[PDB]
Amino acid sequence: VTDAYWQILFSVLKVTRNLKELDLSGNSLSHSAVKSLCKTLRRPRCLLETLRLAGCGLTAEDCKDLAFGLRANQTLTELDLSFNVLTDAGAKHLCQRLRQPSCKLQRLQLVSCGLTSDCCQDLASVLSASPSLKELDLQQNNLDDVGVRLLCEGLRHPACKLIRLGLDQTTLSDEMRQELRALEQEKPQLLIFSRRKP
Numbered sequence: 001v002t003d004a005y006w007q008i009l010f011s012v013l014k015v016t017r018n019l020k021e022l023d024l025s026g027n028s029l030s031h032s033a034v035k036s037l038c039k040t041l042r043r044p045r046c047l048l049e050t051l052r053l054a055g056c057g058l059t060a061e062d063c064k065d066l067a068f069g070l071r072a073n074q075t076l077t078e079l080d081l082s083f084n085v086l087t088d089a090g091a092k093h094l095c096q097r098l099r100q101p102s103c104k105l106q107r108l109q110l111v112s113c114g115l116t117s118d119c120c121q122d123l124a125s126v127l128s129a130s131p132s133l134k135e136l137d138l139q140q141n142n143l144d145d146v147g148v149r150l151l152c153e154g155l156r157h158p159a160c161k162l163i164r165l166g167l168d169q170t171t172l173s174d175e176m177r178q179e180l181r182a183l184e185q186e187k188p189q190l191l192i193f194s195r196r197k198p
């Protein structure tokens with residue numbers, strides 16, 4: 001799918017009304033496509049509350065353009081970036097924006113994005129300073145005890161507001177698992193799920 005097409009597609013979006021959910025999952029988005037989309041997100045009338053970019057071929061550099069295009073947006077509440085090789089570098093660009101008080105995302109999914117323990121400090125930073133984040137899906141990533149313990153510091157922060165955290169506990173030490181279960185009692189309304197655990 002060619003750049004000229006994308007360019008015209010995102011121009012059609014700016015002039016259609018009460019379009020509140022954009023779902024491009026499955027479409028490979030070139031870097032030209034990703035920059036165009038950053039423009040439709042930076043028009044002040046962007047009525048978009050849900051943006052789904054799962055399995056689109058996004059890379060770390062696309063996260064920079066994405067976080068930049070959302071600096072002046074306070075309407076978007078769902079973002080799906082699952083199934084893109086974003087790496088901890090991509091996740092870092094995103095966190096710098098999610099951590100802003102101006103950003104009020106509620107649901108973020110980063111399922112299967114190639115994240116490791118390296119990004120958990122930037123994630124915990126979001127956890128302990130986000131005014132509206134209620135759902136963070138980190139399933140199907142390679143987080144170990146190093147990373148999860150940094151997440152727990154963000155979870156225990158009295159400002160943290162998460163109610164659902166998708167997190168695979170497959171390779172965590174039993175010490176780690178116990179820390180996670182103790183946190184069910186310090187934060188009674190946080191649910192820690194995993195479709196990968198029976």
Ligand code: NA
Pocket residue numbers: 098099100101102103104129130131132
């Ligand atoms: Na925030």
